[PDB]
């Protein structure tokens, strides 16, 4: 992403929506739900807060943080070796290898009995109130505005309180701004293209940056001169 994620409070979107006379029954309560829906539907990883938090494994099981949404990595605390996805169907079940993990709810199922594991996860940036905090990018703001307007107009169209042409226009505009917002947050910046370039050109390919925390992924590959 080229631009920086400067955070602003949620009613910034209600400042802009309520300019429309047909959206004056919208509320913070509705904006919260539709904002969370938009955040998930776009799935942008720059909108989440990166956190690292250690936990203990009692026996092939560990308690997971409260605010976790998605895991970047899990690794062993003492070695630093990363874990992979668990493909085993009988992990801690005995009868009569490398470490891996599997997470469903508040519980992470590892293949290790008693160790500390480090989890690098993504959460939502919250407010002084326990509420979501949105980027102030006017592209993001316009796209979220258009998302909420599209949902409200879809309800009102299901009633027959909006013309089909009005909803068709709203859907067209939301679709274009959704694509544009997707490209805004995903296209790398200059530093991210230097990292991608140093990942791309290897005379000797590097294929083991998962073992580390992808630390050396964008490190330049130097060849000595002979």
């Amino acid at each position: 992403m080229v631009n920086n994620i400067n955070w602003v409070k949620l009613p910034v979107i209600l400042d802009r929506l309520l300019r429309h006379p047909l959206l004056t029954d919208l509320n913070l309560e509705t904006a919260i739900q539709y904002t969370l829906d938009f955040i998930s539907a776009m799935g942008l990883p720059n909108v989440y807060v990166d956190k690292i938090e250690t936990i203990d494994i009692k026996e092939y099981r560990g308690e997971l943080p409260c605010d976790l949404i998605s895991i970047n990595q899990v690794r062993l605390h003492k070695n630093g070796i990363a874990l992979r996805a668990m493909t085993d169907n009988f992990n801690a079940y005995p009868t009569h290898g490398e470490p891996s993990f599997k997470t469903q709810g508040r519980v992470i199922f590892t293949s290790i009995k008693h160790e500390k594991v480090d989890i690098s996860y993504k959460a939502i940036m919250l407010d002084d109130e326990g509420l979501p905090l949105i980027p102030d990018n006017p592209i993001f703001l316009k796209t979220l505005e258009l998302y909420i307007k599209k949902e409200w107009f879809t309800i009102l169209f299901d009633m027959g309180k909006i013309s089909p042409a009005v909803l068709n226009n709203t859907q067209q505009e939301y679709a274009f701004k959704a694509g544009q917002c997707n490209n805004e947050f995903v296209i790398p910046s200059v530093s991210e293209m230097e990292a991608i370039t140093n990942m791309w050109n290897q005379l000797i390919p590097r294929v083991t940056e998962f073992r580390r925390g992808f630390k050396n992924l964008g490190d330049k590959e130097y060849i000595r001169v002979h």
Binding site: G160, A165, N168
Partner: peptide
């Protein structure tokens, strides 16, 4: 005698129906 309750609402409904036809002919 007179009373415009049913008359007014039927006229309003007629106007709403040609309203919907007119807007349903609108295309971007």
């Amino acid at each position: 005698f007179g009373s415009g309750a049913i008359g007014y609402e039927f006229d309003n409904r007629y106007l709403n129906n040609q309203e919907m036809s007119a807007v349903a002919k609108q295309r971007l």
